[PDB]
Nucleic acid binder design. Sequence first.
DNA 1: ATCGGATGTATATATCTGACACGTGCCTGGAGACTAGGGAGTAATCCCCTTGGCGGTTAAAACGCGGGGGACAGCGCGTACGTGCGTTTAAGCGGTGCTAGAGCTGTCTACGACCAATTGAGCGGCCTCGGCACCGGGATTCTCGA
DNA 2: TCGAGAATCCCGGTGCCGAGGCCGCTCAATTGGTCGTAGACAGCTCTAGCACCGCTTAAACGCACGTACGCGCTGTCCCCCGCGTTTTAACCGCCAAGGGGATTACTCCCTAGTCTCCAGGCACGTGTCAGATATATACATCCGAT
Lengths: 87, 86, 525, 95, 98, 93, 93, 107, 107
Amino acid sequence: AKRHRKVLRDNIQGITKPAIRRLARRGGVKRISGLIYEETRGVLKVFLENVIRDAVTYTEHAKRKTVTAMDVVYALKRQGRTLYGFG
Amino acid sequence: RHRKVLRDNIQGITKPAIRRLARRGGVKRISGLIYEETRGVLKVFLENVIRDAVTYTEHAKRKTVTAMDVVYALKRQGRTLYGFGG
Amino acid sequence: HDPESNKKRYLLKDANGKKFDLEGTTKRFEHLLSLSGLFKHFIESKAAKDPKFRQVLDVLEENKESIEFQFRESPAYVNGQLRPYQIQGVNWLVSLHKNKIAGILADEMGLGKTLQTISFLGYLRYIEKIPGPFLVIAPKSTLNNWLREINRWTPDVNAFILQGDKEERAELIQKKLLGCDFDVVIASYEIIIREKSPLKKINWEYIIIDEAHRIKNEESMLSQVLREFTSRNRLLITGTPLQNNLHELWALLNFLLPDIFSDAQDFDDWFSSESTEEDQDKIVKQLHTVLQPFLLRRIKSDVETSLLPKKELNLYVGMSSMQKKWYKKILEKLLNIMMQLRKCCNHPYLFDGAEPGPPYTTDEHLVYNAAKLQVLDKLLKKLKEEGSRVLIFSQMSRLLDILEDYCYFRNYEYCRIDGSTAHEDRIQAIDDYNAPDSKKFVFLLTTRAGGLGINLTSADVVVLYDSDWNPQADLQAMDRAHRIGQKKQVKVFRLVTDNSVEEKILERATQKLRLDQLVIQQNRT
Amino acid sequence: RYRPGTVALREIRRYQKSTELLIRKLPFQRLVREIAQDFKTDLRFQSSAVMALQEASEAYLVALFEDTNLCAIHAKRVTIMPKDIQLARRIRGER
Amino acid sequence: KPHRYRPGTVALREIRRYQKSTELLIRKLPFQRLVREIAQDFKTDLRFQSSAVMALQEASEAYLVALFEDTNLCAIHAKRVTIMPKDIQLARRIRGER
Amino acid sequence: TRKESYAIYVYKVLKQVHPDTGISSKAMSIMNSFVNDVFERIAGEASRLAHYNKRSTITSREIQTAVRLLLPGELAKHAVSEGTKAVTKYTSA
Amino acid sequence: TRKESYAIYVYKVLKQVHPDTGISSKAMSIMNSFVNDVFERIAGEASRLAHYNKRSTITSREIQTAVRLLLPGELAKHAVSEGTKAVTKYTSA
Amino acid sequence: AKAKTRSSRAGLQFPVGRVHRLLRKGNYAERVGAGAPVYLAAVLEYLTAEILELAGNAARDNKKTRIIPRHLQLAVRNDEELNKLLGRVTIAQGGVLPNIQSVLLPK
Amino acid sequence: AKAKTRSSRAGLQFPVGRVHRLLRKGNYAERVGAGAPVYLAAVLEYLTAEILELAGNAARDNKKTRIIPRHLQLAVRNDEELNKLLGRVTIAQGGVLPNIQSVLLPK
DNA sequence: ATCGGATGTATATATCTGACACGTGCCTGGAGACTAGGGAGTAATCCCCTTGGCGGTTAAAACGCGGGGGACAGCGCGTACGTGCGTTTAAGCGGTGCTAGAGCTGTCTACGACCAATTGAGCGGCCTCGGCACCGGGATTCTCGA
DNA sequence: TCGAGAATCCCGGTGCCGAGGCCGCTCAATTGGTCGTAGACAGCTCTAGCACCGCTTAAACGCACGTACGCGCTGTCCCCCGCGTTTTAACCGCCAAGGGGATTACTCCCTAGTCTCCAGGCACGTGTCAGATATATACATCCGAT
Ligand SMILES: [Cl-]
């Protein structure tokens, strides 16, 4: 069976409990429930899907196999989340 | 033109009008302090939109406000209105 | 001495102790130009921008003590007697010092290495009467080995290892380093990067760096840090100089003598960029004499005899059907690199979905979907009668997983060492396999793993089931069983796939190996 | 006599089905051309301009109440309050 | 009995610690793994610039921080101090993402 | 005078999708506003694309990228299909 | 290789308000992006404003109206005053 | 020879000459390709046909023969991902989708 | 004659010539006027001076003589007009304004 | 559970007005030369990204347990809403007059485009040295059992 | 209720590396000179806005009442925080070879833009009728008090 690498922990589980706790602290919350740790992961995954979709559209229009920071900036500005400091 | 400067016309946004807007919003029970908040927010919204419309009108050297100018102001604010032009 | 005498001398007397010294560089230029005249190329190359070296050239040219203390058989200060060629090496080192230059020691691993080093340090302390400091940079696995060697063949010195956690290292530094209560400071690479600032503010005599081949890239952080260190001279220890290129030899030389080999372009235009006629031949290769004084290498065929040689063979396997379809799929188009070609040449099941089903089974069908593995199975079956234990190497541990599951499918007894197995279980594993009667037929390993202290000497056959870009890594894997110790004939079987990229990898490996052959080995003497 | 709630629900159903204007045209026009004279003096207006202003204003207010109601329900009430509007339009980004 | 703070007095200390610094609160490698396995869907065989991944992480962290602030306001408005998934759902519904 | 519109074309599309229904003046005006708004959105996105890639011409590739970047999912796929088959027919004829 | 930026002018404005305060690289990039964004907003709004009135030329009147539309409150007031002052000085020179 | 409109050549119904002229005198780029007007007209025609068949279905659902802004609003708001396209848009003389919260309903 | 920069004639610091070229090549109109670059350069200069003055004040408050994105963020978010102008914008490596809800403090 | 109101909800009929059909002309889109320049193809080169692996440090991360305080539920109560009914009041329609100012036409300048020549202003590359990060340690201060 | 103890801030005192001048070069901004045409500016027209005056009659307004509901208080679990202890994965570094992309420098060709002509497509002005309101009108169908 050890021919097959045992399936790794899911990538969305890489946003650990302490990381979400730190984000919530910077947001200014004191107490935190136990289901936020999955609701937040879902929200982050959805946001990332949208931005990645737009960035990939740009980078394949440009005839390149390389997503670039300036494409990410274009995608964010398209969504209406302009970001200063990268282009 | 004549006898048009008026005061307290925000009191013309009557309480039953607020209640009808609340019903279309699907609100069942309404507190008594709600009308002043509604008048304040409506006045702020109107001030912004009318400011932008008057800016467009002044730039075009006109001095009559057109529905197309109102549409421009609304679209610039991000509230695209369909039906009156564009 | 006492700590205060060490404090009055060790610490940098000035704020900026790094400055151009003229006497030493003039001495080096005069001695080397006396040795040979090819160096004028380097000197004119370095004088193009800065002309004070050009006035050094002028003064040393227009005007046209390294006492021969042979330092014979092992003096009493180093306990016991030792190999006469080691006395020859120490004489080499002494003459190197007395000519105010440095030089790589390139003795083959296991040929009494670091012993000449400690003896030379004792010579410095007793015949030259000079105390420390002496920085020693070695891989972590050899720190305690170095310390034991120093403390058991020249115990009347000060030497400690600079290892530990943050706080233990900090207190040790403030106690001894800033305390100036040492003669030799044993430290590891990572420690050298970590403890840069305290170690800078010491007037170093030498900086001994074992396995010097680690410093072969001049953009490496360790190379930058060592350049930033102040020292009087240097000394390099490594068994495989010029592993896979000619430029890295210049990279070693630059750290050795930063005032001689100060230009990369000059050295890479010395021989490399000229291939038309005999100018790529005898004359240009005999221009190697520039490398003659800076290096010494000795072979296991000059010294201990024993160790019958090697019997390297090649087993040209043929592509299998599933391998064929995967290889054609890869060639024309997850997959993002040519490394997929080598993966396919090794075993198709590395790619996901290659196992049919999957219902998870480990039956005889494994060797069916593999070219090399069938030859491997037949080879193991043939070797089982003579009971010769096996060391299998590879480039991917993920391949070793398939191989070990094959291993226990046919009921064999293996034992792994990879990048994930810790130190203590590694040690117990090597003890188990090297037992006087060990019931573990095969042993698995990764080519570039385990360091150098591994002593898998109990077996006789070593299959390089995959090849490597650097032939030196494969050579280390081979001498891992061919070192002193094992006395039966060591047999090594590389497996090569035809009509595939493995031919190209082998061919480039042979280019680099023969380049190493022509550059160093004949002129090794 | 009906109980408190029945007439409110029937009114909700009535007004969520019509399309006509819930604010009086002439009071809204007076308010609009009163606000106007604080930016420029002696303006004229188009009937369709005031009509568009009303159509946007009521849409804004209805959309705001549709969030005020959700905020009220989130607090285990059924009544809407000034704090409900303040929270709704603070989250929406209008401060 | 050893010294022990009462609940909340460490939470506020972390609140004011993190509302004062500027570094990234998510580890780099897990986030890179996340938005590479997400990008594997729309198109395969992509190469990501380090700067591109950094911009993505900056934007996502800012988004989550703002969302958590509005969730905090929702929870306070509900006469609570603990945030719950209903607060996040309401916050995203109001602002228009639901 | 002579203000132009899309009414004559919207009416044709209506009469070929629902052969026996009508449309009021206000609804026709709303459809006109919709068409103008969508045209402006797509053209603006295409112009920004062409400026982004330092090209100096709008073409079918920019239009297709803009529509796939502006319309959500299933609408984007059908719109792309429509545009490609229309352009192929035009090129052939 | 030659990439143009507003860094050398932002670090002349800085040395007139705070004559002895430096600015980091990241802040410089943010400043360049900010002036780029504001330029884009003003230029786009002025272009649309010209297109609405069927004018072919963009000029200071459209720039004034665009800044009065984009900037809030006293910021627009001061910016308009400064722009008029600069235009009058230039046309007098 | 007798002229053949490019919209007839492409088999479309929206005008390609008008789209080309707008793209040209609309300050979008210095040059405009020849397939771009055709592609854009096809896309516009598709979106019009989609929203218009939804509006016709609503009009027939209300037993009306003509289409009105109420029907347009019903179609757009009911259809997901057309609602997402017209997310920030306001349709005059439209309305709201019939919707009452669950907790408001009588026991 | 002798060259005399348009910025110097206007008494400005921002490049009037480069602003003019950007306006002309950005496909904003058919032809740009003559006072438009001057007006736009003046406006950009005003906005930059305002931002930098506030950021330098924040840096001095933090006892550091060098503006950083944290100082830019503090300057922008502590003024109402600037914050309204840059509401959607997010500053990289900016951080958050210190803020704790009053009901969250100990009794 | 039953019965009595009150409120939508189908159903027939008259009115009208707004959508739809039809004729004209005029302007704009299509047809046909002619060209130039934008973009496609090629080719050096120099740096960045990928894949698989190894070795080492060390903070975070994970898991466990106690216990406290907060959420959730239940209960009482006293308003603050909803409902309903008279009675004012002002919005809506319908009309009229008055007029300004929004819109269309001519025309004839100033002023923006284009081109050539020229030159300083800005950009890339290099070196360095203060500004800031880091590490104690000592002193202050802020929380928590009494 | 005041001491005990942990956290934090403020001093000095290193180090290091990013900003910030300095220099050479080149290429876009400046100056000078046509010239073709937007767009002020004047003038004429007539449409849509503004202003009242009158009727009527439905929406607002004020007042009563009584009754659900929002709010405060009280318990009680339970679940989330805070602190220890152990494990592990992130983060540097380092190796090998590739391809990808960003320049710069070209060549060249085909597809746009620019003209000149000229007819049909579409926009506007009309003239119809049937689809959509308006009234009544009977029926079905919740809601609330016994
Ligand atoms: Cl050795």
